[PDB]
Write a protein that binds this DNA or RNA. Structure first.
Ligand SMILES: [Mg+2]
Ligand SMILES: [Zn+2]
Ligand SMILES: [Zn+2]
Lengths: 49, 82, 49, 196, 115, 51, 259, 147, 67, 404, 45
RNA sequence: UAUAUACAUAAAGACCAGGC
């Protein structure tokens, strides 16, 4: 085990990938939420191209 | 300098009339005798402005010429612009 | 952001369709920050094997 | 036409964009390959105009209004405005109070504005459907006179109706969030939450 | 945080007189009325009733500022007719108009229902 | 050469045409903080003992 | 030098609506009437709200907002109630206010709509208006959510807060075909004609009338459902004449005091 | 009256004042503008799509359809809009006859009214207001604090 | 969030016409015919029901703090 | 108080004021005062510095008061003048047409603070008494102040021939003995310029009598404008169906004269102007044609505007807008420039993927032949965006140089 | 002493100062503060 | 009965975003 990599939300490796609308609500996520950002120390970070 | 040969404008520059009505109103605002009859005036700036038009203000202005000398003009001798 | 050179800021004909002409910040950042057009898709890359 | 009939029914056909790209109908073209291409704005330019500008058009664009970003796609009639005025709206479209995310009751964020009564516009770009701006609209329609009335609206100011503002018009909520963290720092030094 | 109370428009607190009458030194027989906590509803009725009075040379109102609620009504009448008399006859003439209108509106209602 | 100062206030501006040229609207909460030291005399001591 | 004598003709009278036509009046008197139809006609509307338990997705003062705007049946007892400020008693009595109660809990799996029909009043006279046509919707509830609150409704009028306006839009029009030239059309032929126009389709405007002054002031007064539209009007006249009878009083006390 | 509103066309401005529904100029039908903006905003700024939105959206309040603003059509003209607006009984250019709110009298010039889409901005007056008298003081300079 | 009581401009009540307006759309009325059956003549009211966006149905998907 | 707005460019951006305390949250200031501070009301802010002693408070009062600073030492013109609706209303208030009845005079006179108590005798005594705007405005003008300016539309042929002093169009302004005899007021008389009716007041009367001069124009002509009102509407941005044909036949004629100049250069028949590269003489001849196009269609659009047009109302009185904004709304937006040159080639030898290589025609190089009203076509929208970016950039760059 | 609401199973548990935060019958670490008893009184304005 | 509870602390810096 070398380390831990921050995971972009709704990528193929998030827990929210492939979930439907009903399941995203039980997990208290917005279905309209585009995704593509990171959670570092609770803040939501956006890598800028 | 002598009272003769004074070379300066007889008029009161708007800088002198700004510091005369300020310095006079600060005196009036501390128990200072008032030269002019005041009628319904509780405000010092209005009193000091009134003393000026009547030429009652007791101040002499010392004007430094640029070469180091000076002249002493009393506020009556000067001519009020406004 | 400091530089007063206006060549990097100006809108360039090659930005047709891949970058939004109107959307851009103002102040010192004028034209240095650029939004993307709707259809534009950045390419993820591959191997030329 | 047979391609469009299949996309029209796209639901439950398992037939979508990738099956459109795989038929050679659409093509991705980056910039420096746009130097070797002839584009037609619309299929109109392809028909014979009797005076041939170009007979060679090698690609047609899907729609001309997709050249605009996400914040400049909300402007109605953007081609009718002086050009800095679509740039300013791009700056003021990001500052608008509206419902930002639908789960906001769960989220704890410093500085969350929200607005009681959003409304989807009455004059709406046809690409707002793909910005999901009917779901999370930020704004309200309003009846707008353009008149010099009492002089209070001069310069860039606006006069408002106070009977409207009493009914919930542009009446919003401002959430502010605080956090404090108990900790153990010194050997004997502890912090505790307690009523002093 | 500085928003004034809603009731502050029509309510008088301690010490404010409703009406304040001050003579006008520019002109003979000119008077200037000051009405606290009123607006264009009340001021416009009176002005327009004063201009029917042929012994009234001048009448007009203004709201000095919209955020403070008071009316200022100048009236100038002809000699030997007092501007306070002009302003009272105005108010009693509206009351004698509006009492005639409320009675004529009640008759048209009963006529209107089943008739 | 320049420095932060006391007795200053900053807020938005909006038109009031009902004012003169040289007047300005100052809200009551911005006018409640900012104070002006006033020297007591026999003239104003009636007014200031009330303030 | 005296008041003119106006006349009234009621054209349409329904439960939502009154059209009357006032003639032989000033422009300023006819206005100040409709300008009282909004402000100064008193009405009953919720003001003091107390929220015991709110589990709804809508925060407290967002529901306390919607409750205020609900119209209440003011038909009669508005005359009887006293303004809460003039009322002598501590807090609220039966004389200055009405008590409402809403206790609503969603047990079922289905989404429950709390409707104004759930406001329960201590007095039979004043209820929500729809209860006198679907019911106003205060809020929706998922299973497990509970909203219970207590609210005292007061007497007030439309200057205070817009929730005391007895009326929906009050129309006003005079001189429909333009004789007086108070409004000057650049091209007279492009404008539609008023419902009240006396003109044939051929000619655009009436010819200029130099001597005339505005009369025949056409109203349409549409109630919100609190007060039947016939008695929005009777309460405006009786409420303007009471402000003019407050002047003649306090003016007379000053002329007698000053002199 | 300090807060900051802006349309979609780049017209931003504060609130000047708030008149009650009484004091607002009303149409023949009793419609009073929620918001009145100064006409001088338009000529030098040249946002005309602000004038067509008030126009396009007055046909789309009447017809019940949500209008189509998409930038490049040739299927929507100011002239094809106006012909739809003349059918609902309005002047086709959107001008409408108003009565003064205070005095009741008509306003000579015809006024241009329509429904338009405004945004309220993160910038409010309550958060921009500041006043300073003899408060905290910096440690090093013994001068007033920043912010 | 939820349909306003009291249309902003005029002050008529559109609060109670929403659940009656969704019924007419599912009966294949056009928004012009729907809003005329509901009896909304002025375009100040017709823009309340027509431009409304109902988020109270989205917000009821999340589960409350208390069971 | 002393009252500030950053950056302070000249000394009119700090002027002493006189507090009046009003509710809500915002400082409030007269609109004439928005000229010196260069502040429009959209989210602006302004500092307030309350002087703390009678001795420094008597400096502000006799030095920096706004009525003292009316006239600037820089250009020896007034700083503050009538601005926005009032300068549009003055003109509409001052035409010969304006006749105020007895009821509407009583209100206006009520807002004159200097009014001496005497209702002037109507200009038209019978059949019905009617005052004139020039007759009421002559009560505003203080003292006995005297001016001759000329209105903006004043034709040049007028001063020479007959009807010098009758002035058919009422352009020439005369003020004799503090009474406005003839002419329409505008930016050139009430505005800020040397010799304006405002500048003669401060010089001849004084700073005190000219303070009541601004406050009377604004209050009596803002409370008059509630009767006329003002607007901009789509009916005012639109021309005749006959004018739309004259605006096209000039464009087709222009774009046809550019094809001949282009065809002459392909065959080499184009001879270079001395001192000019053949590329420099070609880029000039195409700019000489296209400018005449947009200069002709502009003046063909300004002939079509009716007297009731509101654009013409805001332009003629100089209140806001210029004659070149009317052209672009109604007629043609015209050539779009980048760095003073016609749109360059970003691709290889063509401007956008749609155009053919080596197209110098008017459409390919950025000439926009559509007006904001008819709407810009897709590419004209992009080139119009390229010409506007050059405006945003300059405004961001120049300010930091002009401040250093 | 202090009643908190679990953010997962929504069961009020009574937990007191100087205790780790875990709800019984879940194990979920996020607790909420319930709601105050004292009188709140709003204007319908 | 008298007398008393009087104010200080939240550092600073860095980058980032926006306002005029
Ligand atoms: Mg600004
Ligand atoms: Zn409505
Ligand atoms: Zn648990």
């Amino acid at each position: 085990f070398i380390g831990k990599i921050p995971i972009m939300l709704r990528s193929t490796y998030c827990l929210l990938n492939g979930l439907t609308d009903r399941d995203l609500c039980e997990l208290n996520e917005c279905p309209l939420d585009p995704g593509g950002y990171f959670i570092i120390n609770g803040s939501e970070k956006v890598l800028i191209a | 300098q002598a009272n003769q040969k004074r070379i300066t404008t007889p008029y009161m520059t708007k800088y002198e009339r700004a510091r005369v009505l300020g310095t006079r109103a600060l005196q009036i605002a501390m128990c200072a005798p008032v030269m002019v009859e005041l009628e319904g005036e509780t405000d010092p700036l209005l009193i000091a402005m009134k003393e000026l038009k009547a030429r009652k203000i007791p101040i002499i202005i010392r004007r430094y010429l640029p070469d180091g000398s000076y002249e002493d003009w009393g506020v009556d001798e000067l001519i009020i612009t406004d | 952001r400091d530089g007063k050179l206006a060549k990097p800021r100006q809108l360039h004909n090659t930005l047709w369709g891949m970058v939004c002409p109107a959307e851009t910040p103002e102040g010192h950042a004028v034209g240095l920050v650029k939004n993307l057009a709707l259809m534009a898709y950045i390419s993820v890359g591959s191997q030329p094997s | 036409k047979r391609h469009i009939d299949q996309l029209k029914e796209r639901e439950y056909n398992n037939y979508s964009w990738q099956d459109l790209v795989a038929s050679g109908v659409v093509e991705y073209i980056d910039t420096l390959e746009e130097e070797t291409v002839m584009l037609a704005m619309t299929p109109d330019d392809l028909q014979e105009k009797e005076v041939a500008y170009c007979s060679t058009y090698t690609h047609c664009e899907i729609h001309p209004s997709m050249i605009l970003g996400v914040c400049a796609s909300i402007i109605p009639f953007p081609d009718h405005n002086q050009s800095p005025r679509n740039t300013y709206q791009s700056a003021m479209g990001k500052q608008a109070m509206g419902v930002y995310i639908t789960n906001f009751h769960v989220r704890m964020d410093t500085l969350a504005h929200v607005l009681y009564y959003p409304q989807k516009p009455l004059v709406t770009t046809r690409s707002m459907e793909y910005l999901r701006f009917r779901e999370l609209p930020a704004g309200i329609n309003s009846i707008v006179a353009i008149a010099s009335y009492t002089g209070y609206n001069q310069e860039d100011s606006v006069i408002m109706n106070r009977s409207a503002v009493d009914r919930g018009f542009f009446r919003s909520v401002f959430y502010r969030s605080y956090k404090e963290q108990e900790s153990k720092k010194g050997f004997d030094q502890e912090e505790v939450f307690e009523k002093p | 945080m500085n928003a004034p109370p809603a009731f502050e428009s029509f309510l008088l607190f301690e010490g404010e007189k409703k009406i304040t009458i001050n003579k006008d030194t520019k002109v003979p027989n000119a008077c200037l009325f000051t009405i606290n906590k009123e607006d264009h509803t009340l001021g416009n009725i009176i002005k327009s009733q004063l201009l029917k009075d042929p012994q009234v040379l001048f009448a007009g109102y203004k709201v000095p500022h919209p955020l403070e609620h008071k009316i200022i009504i100048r009236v100038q009448t002809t000699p030997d007719y007092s501007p306070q008399e002009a302003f009272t006859n105005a108010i009693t003439d509206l009351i004698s108009e509006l009492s005639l209108l409320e009675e004529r509106f009640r008759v048209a209602i009963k006529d209107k229902q089943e008739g | 050469m320049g420095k932060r100062v006391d007795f200053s206030a900053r807020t938005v501006i909006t038109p009031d045409p009902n004012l003169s040229i040289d007047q300005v609207g100052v809200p009551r909460s911005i006018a409640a903080n900012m104070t002006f030291a006033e020297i007591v005399t026999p003239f104003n001591i009636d007014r200031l003992q009330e303030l | 030098p005296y008041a003119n004598q106006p006349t009234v003709r009621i054209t349409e009278l329904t439960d939502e609506n009154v059209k009357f036509i006032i003639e032989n009046t000033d422009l300023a008197v006819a206005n100040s009437i409709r300008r009282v139809f909004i402000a100064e006609v008193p009405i009953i509307a919720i003001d003091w709200v107390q929220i015991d338990a709110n589990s709804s997705v809508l925060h407290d003062e967002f529901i306390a907002h919607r409750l205020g705007l609900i119209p209440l049946t003011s038909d009669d007892i508005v005359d009887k109630l006293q303004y809460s400020r003039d009322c002598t008693c501590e807090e609220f009595c039966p004389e200055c206010s009405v008590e409402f109660t809403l206790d609503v809990r969603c047990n079922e799996d289905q989404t429950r709509h709390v409707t104004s029909r759930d406001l329960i009043s201590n007095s039979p006279r004043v209820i929500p208006v729809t209860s006198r046509q679907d019911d106003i919707l205060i809020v929706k509830l998922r299973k497990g959510q509970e909203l219970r609150l207590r609210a005292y409704a007061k007497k007030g009028f439309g200057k205070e807060h817009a929730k005391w306006n007895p009326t929906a839009g009050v129309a006003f029009e005079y001189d429909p075909d333009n004789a007086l030239r108070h409004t000057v059309y650049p091209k007279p032929e492009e404008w539609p004609k008023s419902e009240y126009s006396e003109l044939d389709e051929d000619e655009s405007q009436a010819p200029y009338d130099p001597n005339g002054k505005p009369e025949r002031f056409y109203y349409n007064v549409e109630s919100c459902g609190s007060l039947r539209p016939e008695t929005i009007v009777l309460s405006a006249l009786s409420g303007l004449k009471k402000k003019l009878s407050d002047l003649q009083t306090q003016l007379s006390h000053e002329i007698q005091s000053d002199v | 009256i300090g807060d900051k509103f802006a349309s979609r066309h780049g017209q931003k401005g504060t609130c000047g004042i708030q008149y009650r529904q009484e004091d607002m100029p009303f149409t023949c039908e009793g419609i009073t503008p929620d918001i009145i903006i100064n006409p001088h905003a338009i000529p030098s700024r040249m946002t005309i799509g602000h004038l067509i939105e008030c126009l396009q959206g007055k046909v789309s309040a009447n017809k019940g359809e949500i209008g189509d603003a998409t930038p490049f059509n040739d299927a929507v003209n100011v002239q094809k809009i106006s012909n739809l607006l003349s059918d609902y009984g309005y002047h086709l250019r959107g001008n409408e006859v108003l009565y003064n709110g205070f005095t009741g009298r008509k306003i000579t010039s015809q006024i241009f009214i329509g429904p338009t889409y405004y945004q309220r901005l993160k910038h409010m007056v309550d958060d921009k207001i500041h006043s300073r008298a003899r408060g905290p003081i910096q440690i090093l300079n013994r001068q007033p604090m920043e912010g | 969030m939820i349909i306003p009581v009291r249309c902003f401009t005029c002050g008529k009540i559109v609060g109670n016409k929403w659940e009656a307006y969704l019924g007419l759309l599912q009966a294949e009325y056009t928004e012009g015919d729907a809003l005329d059956a509901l009896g909304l003549k002025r375009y100040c009211c017709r823009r309340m029901l027509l431009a409304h966006v109902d988020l109270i149905e989205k917000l009821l998907n999340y589960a409350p703090l208390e069971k | 108080v002393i009252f500030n707005r950053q950056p302070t460019l000249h000394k009119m951006s700090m002027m002493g004021h006189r507090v009046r305390i009003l509710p809500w949250s915002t400082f409030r200031l007269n609109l004439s005062v928005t000229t010196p501070y260069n502040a429009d009301f959209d989210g602006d802010e302004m500092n307030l510095h309350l002087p703390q002693s009678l001795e420094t408070r008597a400096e502000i009062q006799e030095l920096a008061m706004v009525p003292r600073m009316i006239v600037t030492p820089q250009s020896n013109r007034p700083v503050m003048g009538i601005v926005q609706d009032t300068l549009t209303a003055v003109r509409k208030f001052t035409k010969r047409d304006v006749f105020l009845e007895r009821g509407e005079v009583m209100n206006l006179l009520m807002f004159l603070s200097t009014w001496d108590g005497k209702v002037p005798q109507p200009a038209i005594l019978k059949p019905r008494p009617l005052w004139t705007g020039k007759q009421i405005f002559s009560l505003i003008i203080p003292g006995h102040i005297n001016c001759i300016r000329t209105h903006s539309t004043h034709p040049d042929d007028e001063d020479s021939g007959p009807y010098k002093h009758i002035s058919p169009g009422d352009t020439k302004v005369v003020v004799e003995n503090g009474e406005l005899i003839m002419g329409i007021l505008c930016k050139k008389s009430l505005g800020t310029s040397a010799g304006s009716l405002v500048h003669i007041s401060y010089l001849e009367m004084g700073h005190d009598i000219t303070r009541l001069f601004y406050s009377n124009i604004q209050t009596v002509i803002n409370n008059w404008l509630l009767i006329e009102g003002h607007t901009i509407g789509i009916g005012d941005s639109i021309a005749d169906s006959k004018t739309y044909q004259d605006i096209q036949n000039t464009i087709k004629k222009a774009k046809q004269d550019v094809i001949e100049v282009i065809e002459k250069a392909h065959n080499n028949e184009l001879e270079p102007t001395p001192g000019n590269t053949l590329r420099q003489t070609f880029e000039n001849q195409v700019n000489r044609i296209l400018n005449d196009a947009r200069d002709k269609t502009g003046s063909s659009a300004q002939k079509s505007l009716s007297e009731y047009n509101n654009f013409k109302s805001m332009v003629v009185s100089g209140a806001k807008g210029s004659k070149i904004n009317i052209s672009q709304v109604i007629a043609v937006v015209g050539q779009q420039n980048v760095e003073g040159k016609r749109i360059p080639f970003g691709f290889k030898h063509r401007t956008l993927p749609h155009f053919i290589k080596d197209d110098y025609g008017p459409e390919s190089r950025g000439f926009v032949e559509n007006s904001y009203l008819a709407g810009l076509t897709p590419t004209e929208f992009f080139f119009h965006a390229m010409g506007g970016r050059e405006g945003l950039i300059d405004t961001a760059v120049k300010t930091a140089e002009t401040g250093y | 002493p202090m009643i908190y609401i679990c953010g997962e199973c929504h069961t009020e548990n009574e937990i007191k100062s100087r205790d780790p935060i875990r709800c019984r019958e879940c194990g979920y670490r996020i607790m909420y503060k319930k709601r105050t008893k004292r009188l709140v009184v709003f204007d319908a304005r």
